[PDB]
Amino acid sequence: VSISYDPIYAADLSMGSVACSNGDHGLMAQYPTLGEVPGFPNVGGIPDIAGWDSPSCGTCWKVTIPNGNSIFIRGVDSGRGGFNVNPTAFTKLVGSTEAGRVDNVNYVQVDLSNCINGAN
């Protein structure tokens, strides 16, 4: 799998613009703004989201790279083929944004508490 980062998932990004908008999996209800469900700097799109109401929305995952570092990303948007997260999370996981996209990234699902504990 290949991972990248997008500048749109910033703190003032409205949740109505992502696939998880209201419906049953909508996160806008309790958290109408991005910066609490994932935490703030641990949010990104993921390939397991279908659309307006993905069944895997709100799922914690750990991303690991060959350098030896990992962060927790909570599902929020869908991806064509790879995991995309905020540029701040990308720089922290790799060290800089010069890499752009890194393939062969290992990912594993963990308890939700770990995502909130890591982000905070």
From Swiss-Prot:
Belongs to the cerato-platanin family. Disulfide bonds join 20-57, 60-115. Residues 17-29, 51-54, 77-81 are annotated as: Binding of N-acetylglucosamine tetramer (GlcNAc-4). GO terms for biological process: modulation of process of another organism. The lineage of its organism: Eukaryota, Fungi, Dikarya, Ascomycota, Pezizomycotina. Keywords: Cell wall, Disulfide bond, Secreted, Signal, Toxin. CDD domains: DPBB_CEPL-like. This is Cerato-platanin. It comes from Ceratocystis fimbriata f. sp. platani. One of its GO terms (molecular function) is toxin activity.
